[PDB]
Amino acid sequence: MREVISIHVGQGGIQVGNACWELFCLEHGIQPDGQMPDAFNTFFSETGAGKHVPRAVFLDLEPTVIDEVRTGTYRQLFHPEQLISGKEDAANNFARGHYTIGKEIVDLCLDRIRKLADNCTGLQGFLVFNSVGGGTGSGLGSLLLERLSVDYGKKSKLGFTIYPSPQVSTAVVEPYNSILSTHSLLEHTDVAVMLDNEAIYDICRRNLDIERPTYTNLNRLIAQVISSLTASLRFDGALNVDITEFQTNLVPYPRIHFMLSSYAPIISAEKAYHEQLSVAEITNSAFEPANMMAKCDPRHGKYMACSMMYRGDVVPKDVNASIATIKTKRTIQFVDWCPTGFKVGINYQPPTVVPGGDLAKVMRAVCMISNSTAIAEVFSRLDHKFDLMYAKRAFVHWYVGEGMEEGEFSEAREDLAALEKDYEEVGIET
Amino acid sequence: QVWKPYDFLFPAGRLAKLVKVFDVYFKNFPFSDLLNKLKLTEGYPIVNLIGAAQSNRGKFYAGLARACFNSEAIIVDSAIETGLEPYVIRRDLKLVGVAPENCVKYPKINSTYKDPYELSNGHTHLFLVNDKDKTLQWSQETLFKIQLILKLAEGKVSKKGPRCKIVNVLLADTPNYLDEVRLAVKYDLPIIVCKGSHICDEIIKNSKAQEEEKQWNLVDDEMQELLQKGHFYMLDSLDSEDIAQYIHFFLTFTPY
Amino acid sequence: VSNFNQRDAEGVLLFQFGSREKQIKRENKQYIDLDKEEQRDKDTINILLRRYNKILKNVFVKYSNTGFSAQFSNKNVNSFDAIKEHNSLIS
Amino acid sequence: MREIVHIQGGQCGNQIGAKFWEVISDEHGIDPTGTYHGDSDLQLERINVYYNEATGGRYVPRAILMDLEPGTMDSVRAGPFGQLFRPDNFVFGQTGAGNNWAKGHYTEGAELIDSVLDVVRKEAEGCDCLQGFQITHSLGGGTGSGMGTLLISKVREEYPDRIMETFSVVPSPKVSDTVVEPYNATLSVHQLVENADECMVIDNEALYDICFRTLKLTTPTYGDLNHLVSAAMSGVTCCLRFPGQLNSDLRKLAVNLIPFPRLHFFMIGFAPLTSRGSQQYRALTVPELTQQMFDAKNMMCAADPRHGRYLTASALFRGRMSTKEVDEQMLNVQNKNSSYFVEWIPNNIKSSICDIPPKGLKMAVTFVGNSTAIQEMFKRVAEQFTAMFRRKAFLHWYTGEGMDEMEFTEAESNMNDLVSEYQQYQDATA
Ligand SMILES: Nc1nc2c(ncn2[C@@H]2O[C@H](COP(=O)(O)OP(=O)(O)OP(=O)(O)O)[C@@H](O)[C@H]2O)c(=O)[nH]1
Ligand SMILES: Nc1nc2c(ncn2[C@@H]2O[C@H](COP(=O)(O)OP(=O)(O)O)[C@@H](O)[C@H]2O)c(=O)[nH]1
């Protein structure tokens, strides 16, 4: 009687949704056709006899990815008319997907959301995935969040956004729409998790020893993180954690809800079994700055609160004996007004392996969600990138001619300045 | 330096020229150099609003603005919001505000509350007058305002011609009209008494009444003496066409 | 626009001696609200719009369906009401 | 969906199209009889982009061919793949222009253009969702440079929101085949900047240089130049017809490569290009592709790109390859050449990946970069124009058909203003 609905918008969102939906189907024993040859209820729904239907909706204005989905092996799984598709792409223009073509599509998506919500009885909250540096992704994510915040109100929404890397970039105009989308979801999303690609590339290179990774390898790690986060809702555990038990433990103030994640262990089968993978060493590896899932240095800032999930055969006393060691270290310092900052969850189900993938099978794993003061650097560098081109009003004509006003750029800049001032104000000791 | 010009940007408004006057009592104030720097060097017909403040005269101000546009007249007021501003902006009229700097407020950016003594958008030229001690109050600027009006109407000294016509419009929406009327009568300037304020309505009503039926409840004895000595013309209409006809007449012809 | 941490102040007060004049000239290189206009202009325009309403409606109907909208290409207009709404709009 | 129609004018444009359509048909496996004989399923999924469907199962291009003389279209019909074109789309006059811009734009081109506009309107009104138009024509001829540019304005007036492409061959002073080239080049550039959403300049001199130096073939002919131009043309829209990691339609390139609406003159290049004798020596790798892609001699224009600074750049990779390598190589090509990239817009290179390579090649790259070095072409064109105009040479031919010298003066002034304001941003600093 506990449910959650995941929203996938944009090319990156759909490509990570595919990645998480192989993993969930594999973890619950459901074949790609949707047929089994009481834990499924969190992500799926029973049709009365036979197949299961995911509680997910796919959105995009550009039809190529959806058409690829509707012809692959998973054509029989998803309901045919929840893969909403458009005709014309926003083409990396934020104003397009927020004012011009997204408005005519958003009504169908909201109707689908209502039709899925009326089925659930114990709706925990929503999940949303969107790559921020794109037109349709950021614009439609903003519009959907704004509609949901007023249609439903206090229901919790979680956002797994992928911000651009510090120096590596695929587009040339992504700072503009990244800043605008951050403006939009700052006052509209309860949790936002950092996911830039460069850090995960470094993780793959160093640990998985892959020298030529593709997007699928990144999306599989993200899917594993999602599964670790939501395992506690569908498996028995000695110390459970619910989604609604987050803003009471990781969010000191309503404005501050951007945090960065990490995962451990990450190791290949060729050298995994030569070492014992004790809980102490994995919880040490999870706190290593080089294993952050976002390219930010935690040594440059304080910690505010750490929520970290275990799964497997871990014993609570071993967890406490390792939290003590971390509190001992002099290179990791917490904020003054937080004496204890750890929330611990323990689950029994070990992580599942996907055949043909990178990760091996292990009995212990740890996933941490940590809120730290050091996150302000990404905001500062994105702001610096934005200012350089906004000084000469470059690329603005592509946005003014799509219905957006001239002054809309300035107030996003003011909100980022306010956020940066707030992060500095919080981190000073009393 | 007795005066300093600035560019003044109204929030969500037009660019104006703002002049700070540091000593209003300065002997032989250099109006020629001031007006040259502002490019106000031609002789202009002047409509001076006496006691102008926020009022329900909307259509009357549309007629006044039309007559001023057709006569190329400069409107002079007290730099505060009157309801003339929309018509002045649309017709590109010159609106000159003269006020004590201490009695007016600068407009706030994105203020939800307008102060009634805020500088109004629509003024093309603002003259903020001070004394040496910055203690100037309303009515103390009046001598500077009339000297400025006379110089605007004369234009450049090299144009050998009569000054342009000046008409005063007594609105009396503020109580501080008396000193400006006293100076207008002293300079032999026509004064149109316009309906719509309690003071003007009393003057118009008493102008039509027989001497034995005259009741003065709001008008001071000094103003009653000025009404006998000056050239006062009663406008018992709020019609936009009637005020336009009066202004156009007095800017073209002197009936006395 | 208020800055970071600025609830409010004044955002547009003073520049050096009309310097902005050169900048405004480079940069430069109004809606008539009938409800705020003179009552005579409102009434005369409404009389003219009534007189010529049949012409204006013929012109409106003549041009409102002349544009090529890919959206209303015959196959996807599922309802007569959507066609009627489109035919009531001019681009 | 999101398909485009083809319109070509003049002899040069007709010869370019005669190879462009052959290349497209060979890519999609369409026989010269209009019958599909392809091997892969993907060859038919998005065939509606360029081809229409008729009874009997054969396919017909949606191309419109126009010229003021019938010879070139009477010759292209007898060539290979000449039967695909619908006979109804052939429109021609009986007089010709004689390389006189005035005749092809005021007297003769004005009366004929109604018939071709009728078929253009027929083609555009019918199609599912319009993406836009692409135009091939030459600026060195009268009828082409006149009728094509007037047709550009007529199309823009009726479809202001669609996108417009123009592949324009400008007359180089090295290989000159017509004495009146500067006049109709300068007159055409005046109108082309006002209406074209994108423009791509191509020079015969650069094509001869490439053929002589990189391919090292003894006797170049127009067939080789046409083949190179056709490969470059096909490379731009490849990801719109095939799936890929990051699809990017023409509008997305328009957003990311044009900073200001008047700066839309790009120069392109295609890689790899190797000689017959050295095609076995080389190994196709991403570094090998990217080193040839930014090579100065590889540009399809004689303009020297190290004489200026790139405002932005774009690359459209083809084939199956890792994205991490592409991103790191793009970063490396931008760190080692920081002097030739403008500094007030960071991360000014756009990348895209398409999983379907060209037939016969495993990897390919199409490069589209907006650079300030293009000023040199307009400088020399205007220099020749002002050298010839000061004596009023050949002016009577133009002035005898209703044109005057005032339109020449305005065109020269506007072209010089474009030259100046294009380099204005080269010296701009942050
Ligand atoms: N982690 C990850 N990021 C991706 C993936 N695909 C695209 N991105 C990121 O998404 C950004 C651009 O947005 P996209 O998702 O590609 O496109 P979009 O969101 O659909 O927006 P449009 O361009 O209008 O279609 C790029 O900067 C990439 O970094 C992916 O598969 N995995
Ligand atoms: N690439 C290519 N260029 C050509 C070909 N034929 C002519 N040209 C170029 O076109 C120019 C002459 O254009 P022209 O034929 O007069 O155009 P028209 O007036 O529209 O017919 C010459 O400078 C040639 O360089 C061809 O087959 N291929």
Ligand SMILES: [Mg+2]
């Ligand atoms: Mg996309």
